[PDB]
Design a protein around this ligand. Structure first.
Ligand SMILES: Nc1nc2c([nH]c(=O)n2[C@H]2C[C@H](O)[C@@H](COP(=O)(O)OP(=O)(O)OP(=O)(O)O)O2)c(=O)[nH]1
Ligand SMILES: OC[C@H]1O[C@@](CO)(O[C@H]2O[C@H](CO)[C@@H](O)[C@H](O)[C@H]2O)[C@@H](O)[C@@H]1O
Ligand SMILES: [Mn+2]
Ligand SMILES: [Mn+2]
Ligand SMILES: [Mn+2]
Length: 129
């Protein structure tokens, strides 16, 4: 069974909205809502990975961010460690830089059922802020 380290960014604006993308229909966790992010590569740190992934996926450079949650999740065919970074300052304006759907979503309106099940405790903890 594959093992991966994944870094994702919770991109939160001043109006308590989060920038959320939707995964492709042929991806793992297909059609799910997601925090932008991706695999931490050999030779880069979790902090470097979340910067690079947000630059690639949505065209922003996160800065002065914090680790909101780190957790492990066993999917049916892979084990993933997820690093959830809270990103409240960034350079740029997030968009669907890889052609993927992305939009701002109110924190209070997030439905954990729309995301991979690994995100459940994070979405709950976010709504507690
Ligand atoms: N990006 C992201 N992935 C998540 C979240 N929750 C969650 O369980 N995952 C899982 C889905 C995938 O198994 C893995 C994310 O990998 P990915 O498909 O984003 O990796 P990547 O962007 O580097 O892949 P690629 O560009 O090479 O296609 O972690 C989330 O909120 N955001
Ligand atoms: O690990 C994040 C944690 O570290 C602090 C400093 O105590 O921030 C540092 O790390 C961030 C991630 O690289 C940087 O964005 C930040 O500029 C740096 O000071 C805390 O702010 C944060 O909780
Ligand atoms: Mn990616
Ligand atoms: Mn990647
Ligand atoms: Mn990704």
């Amino acid at each position: 069974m594959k093992k991966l380290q994944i870094a994702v960014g919770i991109i939160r604006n001043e109006n308590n909205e989060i920038f959320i993308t939707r995964r492709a229909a042929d991806a793992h966790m297909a059609n799910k809502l997601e925090f932008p992010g991706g695999k931490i590569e050999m030779g880069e740190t979790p902090e470097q990975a979340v910067v690079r992934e947000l630059q690639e996926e949505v065209g922003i450079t996160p800065q002065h961010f914090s680790l909101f949650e780190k957790l492990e999740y066993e999917f049916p065919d892979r084990h993933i460690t997820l690093w959830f970074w809270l990103v409240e300052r960034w350079e740029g304006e997030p968009w669907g830089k890889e052609g993927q759907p992305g939009e701002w979503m109110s924190l209070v309106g997030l439905n954990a059922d729309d995301f991979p099940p690994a995100n459940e405790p994070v979405i709950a903890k976010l709504k507690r802020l």
